[PDB]
Design a protein around this ligand. Structure first.
Ligand SMILES: CNc1nc(C)c(-c2nc(Nc3cccc(C(=O)N4CCOCC4)c3)ncc2C#N)s1
Lengths: 293, 254
């Protein structure tokens, strides 16, 4: 069981996370503890989904699950150990900024991880800087599958309470009946711009405020840019009419190719919104390299 | 989109790995095929009372056949295995799953709450947490795109559901094959058409390759009104499924 592991320090808080060491081999790992409701509801559904789906995925850009240890009252998940998360890295680079080739490199690897997911019928539904990990070599990986789900062809109506507010998609805010892989693409779009401008793109503080921050920037949508928008369960004709503005002011450092890619990831119509597979071929990645942080 | 070909290929790969033993019932000393039919028919009723998805039902049957391929069980504990499997399938697939106390209730005071909770943990260990399995239902929704008659769809899911009842002889066919026969048979009964060209190019299944499977299913349809199990027939009488269980089966198929 656990006699072979020795704890070093507490990392954070799902359950509780620790940094530990294997006494016999010397390997360093990350332990995630989960308590079972022995007298009430049993094993949590979030844990059941996270374990069964992560066992199918094996990719250089997805975190690796090493073992699962059973106990009458507890579960222990054993992960590989990584050095830091992206959010903390962005704060350390507040004064100087992140070099452009490194931005290009990181984004390229993130798209490779997401393409593998969708090819194996899996949605993530919680992509944000705090759930993305890096090492001392130049790699980056996806993490925390506690809100994931396996979908079907075609889709059904799923859970409506999803995605952290600052990174949420417009179709969800309007209470759509059907959503799919397009919502993961939108999250990566907001992350792209945040790396560039050193701050969040739409930091709203309410459900209604979040929606308006998008409108003031991309322009208020109509039936010409988004057919069927006025039939959404939460559409209202009293919405103010703002006009779209220049991308030269949205993301000043970005050039021609970079701005072409960004505007396709932020398309209003989910049908026209670019896919992760098709994005890997964009001219922006013609000269991609792999720098070290 | 551009993923539905990658997904279909992957599903054909996983249905081989998630397949039960074909002749397991011969090695179970205390239970039979007749007893298994009684359990499945009861699970169908439960799905109607609490209004659950049809996918949830398909998942539960898959879990049960894999568990009984590895562990010996007496006839008195057979219902306990079924109850815990329907609970796990709900947590995986449903938006609003029923609470544990309600699963205790529908067994009518046969087992305790502590017993249900312990059987849940044992099933997880036996299956090593591998729960995302392909079903007959998953393949049918993809086939439906190659049409758009809504009555042909109801009759197609009717035939597919009937197969879950009888281990002999449907435990020897793969889910993708069962889906293929159920589709063409419903299409020839309603309109009179046949297994589309587009699907032969997609699946690689020809009408000749589906022949042994299709002849088995044809006989099940004819003899349905005299089967000891009747919970499925009455379910598809409802107008929600267009009363498809009232139509008369064809006499020949050529
Ligand atoms: C978001 N919840 C998480 N659960 C696990 C198991 C995570 C995880 N964490 C690490 N390593 C990690 C993450 C965050 C902080 C430090 C950390 O201790 N420092 C960072 C700054 O420099 C010194 C101290 C370490 N690795 C893998 C996983 C996974 N899975 S995150």
């Amino acid at each position: 069981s656990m006699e072979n592991f020795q704890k070093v320090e507490k990392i954070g808080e799902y359950g509780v996370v620790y940094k530990a060491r294997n006494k016999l081999t010397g390997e360093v790992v990350a332990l995630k503890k989960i308590r079972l409701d022995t007298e009430t509801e049993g094993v949590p559904s979030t844990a059941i989904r996270e374990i069964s789906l992560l066992k199918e995925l094996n990719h250089p850009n997805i975190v690796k699950l090493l073992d699962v240890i059973h106990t009458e009252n507890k579960l222990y998940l054993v992960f590989e150990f990584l050095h830091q998360d992206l959010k903390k890295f962005m704060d350390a680079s507040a004064l100087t900024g992140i070099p452009l080739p490194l931005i290009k490199s990181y984004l390229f690897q993130l798209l490779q991880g997401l393409a593998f997911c969708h090819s194996h019928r899996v949605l993530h539904r919680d992509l944000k800087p705090q759930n993305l990990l890096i090492n001392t070599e130049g790699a980056i990986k996806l993490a925390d599958f506690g809100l994931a789900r396996a979908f079907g062809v075609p889709v059904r109506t799923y859970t409506h309470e999803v995605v952290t507010l600052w990174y949420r998609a417009p179709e969800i805010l309007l209470g759509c009946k059907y959503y799919s892989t397009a919502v993961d693409i939108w999250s990566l779009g907001c992350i792209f711009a945040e790396m560039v401008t050193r701050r969040a793109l739409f930091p709203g503080d309410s459900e209604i405020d979040q929606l308006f921050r998008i409108f003031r920037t991309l322009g208020t949508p109509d039936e010409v840019v988004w057919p069927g928008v006025t039939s959404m369960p939460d559409y209202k004709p009293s919405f103010p009419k703002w006009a779209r503005q220049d991308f030269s002011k949205v993301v000043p450092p970005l050039d021609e190719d970079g701005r072409s890619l960004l505007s396709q990831m932020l398309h209003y119509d989910p049908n026209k919104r670019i896919s992760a597979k098709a994005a890997l071929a964009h001219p922006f990645f013609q000269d991609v390299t792999k720098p070290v942080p | 989109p551009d993923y539905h070909e990658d997904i279909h290929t992957y599903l054909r790969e996983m249905e081989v790995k998630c397949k039960p033993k074909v002749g397991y019932m011969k090695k179970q000393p205390d239970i039979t095929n007749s007893m298994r039919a009684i359990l499945v028919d009861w699970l169908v009723e439960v799905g109607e009372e609490y209004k659950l998805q049809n996918e949830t039902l398909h998942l539960a049957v898959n879990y049960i056949d894999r568990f009984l391929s590895s562990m010996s069980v007496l006839r008195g504990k057979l219902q306990l295995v079924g109850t815990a499997a329907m609970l796990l399938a709900s947590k995986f697939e449903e938006i609003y799953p029923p609470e544990v106390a309600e699963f205790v209730y529908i067994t009518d005071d046969t087992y305790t709450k502590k017993q249900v909770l312990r059987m849940e943990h044992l099933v997880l260990k036996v299956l090593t947490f591998d729960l995302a399995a392909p079903t007959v239902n998953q393949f049918l929704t993809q086939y439906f795109l190659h049409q758009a008659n809504c009555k042909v769809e109801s009759l197609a899911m009717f035939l597919g559901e009937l197969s879950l009842i009888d281990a002999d002889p449907y435990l020897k066919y793969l889910p993708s094959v069962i889906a293929a026969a159920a589709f063409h048979l419903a299409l020839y009964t309603v309109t009179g058409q046949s297994w589309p060209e587009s699907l032969i190019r997609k699946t690689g299944y020809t009408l000749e390759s589906l022949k042994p499977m299709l002849l088995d299913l044809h006989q099940t349809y004819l003899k349905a009104p005299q089967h000891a199990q009747q919970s499925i027939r009455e379910k598809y009488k409802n107008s929600k499924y267009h009363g498809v269980s009232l139509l008369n089966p064809p006499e020949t198929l050529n």
